[PDB]
């Protein structure tokens, strides 16, 4: 009836057997013991993990409604207003409304066309700042730091038609720290006792007070420094000139309330910025460690675009090797490796097993994308696979082995923004630098740090960026 799994113990369930760190690696090991679908009890919380494309199809597509909700806990409830946001809402009319209101301002080809030259410039500014850093060509630079500013500027250009001038900008650093604390508080293991053993919830008072205050400070910065300016600019310009203008217009029309507006901002800041950065950083690391692939990419852009001609968004469709490098980075180095948790509001069935209502459903998407029984040597960083035996497999999940952006109703709408940003950024870097390891090393250390939320390079990479002219 229930899926197989390790026998639990009273009130702790499997918590003390498996620990707090549930990631795509040790969930693979459990799948090796218990099969394509297995159950864990984290105290009172049911967790179901599926590890086949067939089961991903069931969770994401065939029963996409039945399993189309999100799990929450007392911490995420504070930050999302108990699902008054977009990401962490259950499936229903609220989610439909939010998803619809966000489509025109954020997630169309027109949004891409209106923002691509900003993305292209922010990428060029990364190159210029690294190009002038004396360390970059010598011991190397931790390039994700400058790329972080690029991601902030790309996303705040879309949201508010604004950017941050430098890594030293006070507002940029204030916002960065609030976003970091927002995610640290929601991803910390230290509140698990009160979620898994709910009778202990009173002892979380202090932790939850900390979450309240963080939300207060973070929403205040969103409001004071970005949202209120748009109301002012909207009134004086009389028009709708950025994504969040559309959102505020929906509030003015009475379709949403101001809390919904701020939760959209809250969502984009945790869903879009560091997430894209992880893939860019991973791709840089693998390009350093695969010089032949790096040179082949550089040759593609020179051949297709011409020498010295910068890559732009409309060029990506005629740079299939660049696109394949991006897909292979999302495959081998999938940085959101368990997607986002799904949840069934009502009792359901998967693979014939009964799934209790409100179970947390995890798709091990990294494993789907790296299963040696379903891919040709997935351990290799081989972008050519997406030009050869995988040449029809795309990032939007037409093949249920490769679902880095999900599939179906709860799939990532930001795919339309992430893919061009990654491609432009990697292309621009390779057009201007030889990407090399630091002098004392032959390779970038690509050891994973797998967690329930992200699969980041464990050590932020120090990259030597040697100008091609040097």
We find the least distance from the C-beta atom of residue 364 to ligand HEM, in angstroms, to be: 12
Residue stretches of the annotated binding site for heme: 412
CA–CA separation, 405 vs 418, rounded Å? 10
- Under a CB-based contact definition with an 8 Å cutoff, are residues 71 and 343 in contact? yes
Which one of 137-145, 233-241, 246-254, 412-420 is the stretch in contact with ligand HEM (CB under 6 A)? Answer: 412-420
* Residue 268 binds ligand HEM, judged by CB under 6 A: yes
* Residue 24 binds ligand HEM, judged by CB under 6 A: no
DSSP state of 343: E
DSSP state of 399: S
Task: Choose between 282 and 433: whose C-beta lies nearer to ligand HEM.
Answer: 282
* Residue 413 binds ligand HEM, judged by CB under 6 A: yes
* Residue 271 binds ligand HEM, judged by CB under 6 A: yes
* Residue 327 binds ligand HEM, judged by CB under 6 A: no
CA–CA separation, 61 vs 53, rounded Å? 11
Which one of 138-146, 284-292, 334-342, 350-358 is the stretch in contact with ligand HEM (CB under 6 A)? Answer: 334-342
Nearest residue to ligand HEM, by Cβ distance, number only: 414
* Residue 242 binds ligand HEM, judged by CB under 6 A: no
Residue 88 structure tokens: 């962490």
- Give, in order, the Cα–Cα distances in Å from 245 to each of 81, 106, 160, 260: 22, 11, 8, 14
Task: Choose between 15 and 152: whose C-beta lies nearer to ligand HEM.
Answer: 152
* Residue 39 binds ligand HEM, judged by CB under 6 A: no
Q: Give the 3-state secondary structure of residue 147.
A: helix
Nearest to 419 by CA among 176, 105, 154: 154
- Under a CB-based contact definition with an 8 Å cutoff, are residues 111 and 243 in contact? yes
Contact positions with ligand HEM (CB under 6 A) in 116-145: none
Task: Choose between 101 and 185: whose C-beta lies nearer to ligand HEM.
Answer: 101
* Residue 430 binds ligand HEM, judged by CB under 6 A: no
* Residue 450 binds ligand HEM, judged by CB under 6 A: no
- Under a CB-based contact definition with an 8 Å cutoff, are residues 304 and 315 in contact? yes
Write the CB contacts of 129 (distance below 8 Å, at least 6 apart in sequence): 146
Residues found near ligand HEM in the complex (CB under 6 A): 60, 86-87, 99, 106, 267-268, 271-272, 275-276, 279, 336, 339-340, 404-406, 410-414, 417-418
């Amino acid at each position: 009836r229930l899926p197989p799994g390790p026998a639990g113990a009273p009130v702790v369930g499997n918590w003390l057997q498996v620990g707090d760190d549930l990631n795509h690696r040790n969930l693979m090991s459990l799948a090796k013991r218990f099969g394509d679908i297995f159950l864990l009890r984290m105290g009172v919380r049911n967790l179901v993990v599926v590890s086949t494309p067939e089961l991903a199809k069931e969770v994401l597509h065939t029963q996409g409604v039945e399993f189309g909700s999100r799990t929450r806990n007392v911490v995420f409830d504070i930050f999302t207003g108990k699902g008054q946001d977009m990401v962490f809402t259950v499936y229903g009319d609220h989610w439909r409304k939010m998803r619809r209101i966000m489509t025109v301002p954020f997630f169309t080809n027109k949004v891409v066309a209106q923002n691509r030259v900003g993305w292209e410039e922010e990428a060029r500014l990364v190159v210029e700042d690294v190009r002038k850093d004396p360390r970059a060509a010598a011991e190397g630079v931790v390039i994700r730091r400058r790329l972080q500013l690029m991601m902030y500027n790309d996303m705040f250009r879309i949201m508010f038609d604004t950017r941050f001038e430098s890594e030293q900008d006070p507002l940029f650093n204030k916002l960065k720290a609030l976003n970091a604390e927002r995610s640290r508080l929601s991803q910390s293991f230290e509140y698990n006792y009160g979620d898994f053993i709910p009778v202990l919830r009173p002892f979380l008072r202090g932790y939850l007070n900390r979450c309240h205050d963080l939300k207060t400070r973070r929403m205040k910065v969103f409001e004071d420094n970005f949202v209120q300016e748009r109301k002012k600019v909207m009134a004086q310009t009389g028009e709708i000139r950025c994504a969040m203008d559309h959102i505020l217009e929906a509030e003015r029309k009475g379709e949403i309330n101001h809390d919904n507006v701020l939760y959209i901002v809250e969502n984009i800041n945790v869903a879009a910025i560091e997430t894209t950065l992880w893939s860019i950083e991973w791709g840089i690391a693998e390009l350093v460690n695969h010089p032949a692939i790096q040179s082949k990419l550089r040759e593609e852009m020179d051949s297709v675009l011409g020498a010295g001609v910068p890559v732009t968004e409309p060029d990506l469709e005629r740079l299939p090797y660049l696109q394949a490098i991006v897909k292979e980075t999302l495959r081998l180095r999938m940085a959101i490796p368990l997607l986002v948790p799904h949840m069934n509001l009502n009792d359901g069935k998967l693979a014939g097993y009964d799934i209790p209502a409100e179970s947390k459903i995890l798709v091990n998407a990294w494993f789907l994308a790296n299963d040696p029984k379903r891919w040709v040597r997935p351990d290799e960083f081989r972008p050519e696979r997406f030009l050869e035996e995988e040449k029809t497999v795309e990032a939007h999940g037409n093949d249920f082995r490769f679902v880095p952006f999900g599939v179906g109703r709860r799939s990532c709408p930001g795919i339309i923004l992430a893919l061009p940003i990654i491609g432009i950024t990697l292309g621009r870097l390779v057009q201007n630098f030889q990407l090399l390891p630091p002098p004392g090393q032959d390779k970038i250390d690509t050891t994973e740090k797998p967690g329930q939320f992200s699969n980041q390079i464990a050590k932020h990479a120090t990259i030597v960026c040697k100008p091609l002219e040097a």
